């Protein structure tokens, strides 16, 4: 019930000043564009 508030998404974390930040963010964005994330959401969340 109700409408969404505080609309801030999830996110992979990493330690402050870590070399993995740029590459992890790039891979997440490429997965988003590639349609992989849609397929994952369909497999593990929707269709119940």
Partner 1 sequence: WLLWALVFNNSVPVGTTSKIMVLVWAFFAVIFLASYTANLAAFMIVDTVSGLSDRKFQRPQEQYPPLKFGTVPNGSTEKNIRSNYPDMHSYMVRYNQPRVEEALTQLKAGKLDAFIYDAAVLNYMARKDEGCKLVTIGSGKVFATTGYGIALHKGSRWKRPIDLALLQFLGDDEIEMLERLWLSGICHKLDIDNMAGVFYMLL
Partner 2 sequence: TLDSFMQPFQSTLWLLVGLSVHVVAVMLYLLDLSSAMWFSWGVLLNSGISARILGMVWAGFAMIIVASYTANLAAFLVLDPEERITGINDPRLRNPSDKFIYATVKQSSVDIYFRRQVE
Partner 3 sequence: GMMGELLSGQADMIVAPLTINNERAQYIEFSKPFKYQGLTILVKKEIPS
Ligand X SMILES: *[C@@H]1O[C@H](CO)[C@@H](O[C@@H]2O[C@H](CO)[C@@H](O)[C@H](O)[C@H]2NC(C)=O)[C@H](O)[C@H]1NC(C)=O
Q: What's the rounded Cα separation, in Å, for the pair 20 and 15?
A: 9
Closer residue to partner 2 (CB): 2 or 35: 2
Q: Does 6 bind partner 3 (CB under 8 A)?
A: yes
**Please, after which residues is the chain broken with C–N above 2.5 Å?**
none
Instruction: List the single partner that 2 binds among partner 2, partner 1, ligand X, none, CB under 5 to 8 Å by kind.
Output: partner 2
3 state SS of 18: coil
Scanning the structure block, which residue is given the tokens 């997440």?
A: 28
Task: Give how many residues touch partner 3 by CB under 8 A.
Answer: 28
Residues that bind partner 2 (CB under 8 A): 1-3, 5-6
């Amino acid at each position: 019930t109700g409408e969404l508030f505080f609309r801030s998404g999830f996110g992979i974390g990493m330690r402050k000043d870590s070399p993995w930040k740029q590459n992890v963010s790039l891979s997440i964005l490429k997965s988003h564009e590639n349609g992989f994330m849609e397929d994952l959401d369909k497999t593990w969340v929707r269709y119940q």
